[model samples]
Target chain A: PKYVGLWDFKSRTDEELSFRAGDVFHVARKEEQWWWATLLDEAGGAVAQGYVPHNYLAERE
Target chain B: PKYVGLWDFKSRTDEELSFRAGDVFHVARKEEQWWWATLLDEAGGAVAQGYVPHNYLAER
Candidate 1:
């Protein structure tokens, strides 16, 4: 299970990946509160890999 | 409060200042999980304010 959609961040540690309240990213890896994800743009390819809070991610409905 | 970057980490919390790696930072604040800092380049200009993981930082 891969989550392909947007992600909501309650906090941030890295900005190069830009994980924030309205940013969109995917859960590339998961192990507790840390989710190593790649942020995606509207075109489908863009951005960097970063760790976001577990609750910071929301899958497509 | 000051620190140098040793590793890169994406935030898991809500802080401030987020930019690429490589630079010295002046820490304005610190917490158990968060740290507020200003990034300074060689010229001492590039400024990014954000919290980096405590483990991701070190002394300069």
Candidate 2:
């Protein structure tokens, strides 16, 4: 499923992907806590993949 | 603070750090559910930093 970024996240390490608020992403794995997702560029191209806090994401309309 | 991994964790995404059971990590930020931690290598060097489930870790 797809989710929208509710807040901007900065990567604390090289392992994480940073994204701005209002960005759209795809969830590769949904966890009760963190969700594995891929951040998309403005053109819907893959930007980067990383783990995002569940609270930082919201369902897209 | 320090925490020990109680169970093996496989990262589903590149954003999360993975570790084996008994691995030790340093908590950069502790949350109510997930904790931001830096996984240490066997030599005590940082391997990676990412979000980890609170239940998967135990106080050391």
Candidate 3:
């Protein structure tokens, strides 16, 4: 219901959150280059969160 | 020259980096409560980074 990672992304900076494709997360801040997202587990539990590239995520409808 | 963790701190949020006492990090942003810091490994390589409580860290 929030956003899903479009592809696998490993953090290049400490601020970036790494996630695999299909992972779901909630966007806290939407930005032009990097958007802050909280990574959720399969059970919808918050696992980790950090800034991620906007291009690596897609809005879920 | 940078800072060191004063105690073990587990990340409560995704924005916080978990680290143990004695871990060295470089402060990027200093705030009243939370300060953005980059965690460094034994080799002085950045392993992870995020906001940490100011009380849990001290300048060294």
Candidate 4:
């Protein structure tokens, strides 16, 4: 099951991934450099799990 | 909905449970011993909720 996936990386060109609230994703793996996550949705299904580095996670609001 | 469930308990011993990455699970309840959870998949239907005690959950 996937819920909103969010990240803190701001620049799209940062060799990093960014996510937003309400975005759905599945946690694929947790690595030292980043967390591997896959995007998901009711209609599109599962997408590739991208490497989301550590610096991108936001404080839980 | 459920994905897979993971727990820290190894060997399936200790009347405990364990789960790994890619495992999908649904949170049912938070109890003193464990969190009640269920497993699910894209194809397979819902499974019965099981009690997953604390000390099993990993940081997201």
Candidate 5:
């Protein structure tokens, strides 16, 4: 329950977390290359998770 | 069940498979952006599997 982001990235692969860009997640462990995070459900709980790229955190604007 | 690599990449990622150059595995799937492969044990069995870069397949 820290950072939130959509499962969007420049590239696509089974290894990558696939989702939308506007979605949010509780950012957990952030890395220089990858951000360890998990997706939240509409009820605000952890669900499917994946290591996301840092850039997915675009401006909230 | 084809292709081979010897580790020759400058960049790295968690989505990628990390291993030594001496390791050998059977290429399971190949993609323009990533190559799906699995590392084999001495018994020729799958130990680890992930999407690898095509360049890794180089004889390097």
Candidate 6:
């Protein structure tokens, strides 16, 4: 099955922290209904993590 | 009083390194007259850091 990969977050809402446009993120299927993700800093600290609808993720280059 | 928060830097000049479009940064007030910022990479390495005028920063 297809798995999660890295991405960059942008156009944040008030509820979400505004991250840099090139900051890397990862998304993976947690279940059939949902996906999980987190933002990683340059040294690999997980600065942010959350879940989103599975449909929101796309493949990485 | 308010505090400094994270931000992103873009538009490089000859004096600065060209960063990827999505780099993260943070700013903190050093005093009434100055502030400091550092650019971070996806793994949390501090790619760059420096000071700027106190009035330039905006909140997260």
The estimated TM-scores of all candidates read 0.27, 0.28, 0.26, 0.20, 0.24, 0.21
Q: Mark the regions of model 6 whose C-alpha exceeds 4 Å error after superposition.
A: A1-31, A42-44, B1-60
Q: In model 2, which runs have C-alpha deviations exceeding 4 angstroms?
A: A1-61, B30-60
Candidate 4 segments whose C-alpha is farther than 4 A from its true place = A1-61, B1-30, B42-45
Instruction: Show the colliding residue pairs in model 2.
Output: none
Per-residue alpha-carbon lDDT of candidate 6 for residues A1-61, written as tens digits (9 for 90 to 100): 2211123223233332223434322211233333233434676455543433323333322
True contacts kept of 1: 0.01
Q: Which of the predicted structures, 2 or 3, would earn the higher lDDT when compared with the native? A: 2
Report the C-alpha lDDT of model 5 over B6-49, residue by residue, as the tens digit. 34322255554433333233321232234344444445455544
Best by lDDT: 2
TM-score of chain B of each: 0.40, 0.47, 0.46, 0.29, 0.39, 0.34
**First chain of candidate 5, TM-score:** 0.39
DockQ of each: 0.03, 0.05, 0.03, 0.03, 0.03, 0.03
**For candidate 3, the TM-score of chain A alone relative to the native chain A:** 0.45
User: Candidate 6 on B1-60: residue-level lDDT in tens?
Assistant: 121112332323333222233332221123333323444565655554343332333332
Residues B1-60 of candidate 4: C-alpha lDDT, one tens digit per residue: 223322221223332223333333232222223323333334444433333322333333
The global Cα lDDT (0 to 1) of model 1 is 0.36
Give one digit per residue, the lDDT tens place, for model 3 in B1-60.
Answer: 134445665655565456555544432223234434445544545554454443343333
Model 1: which docking level applies?
incorrect
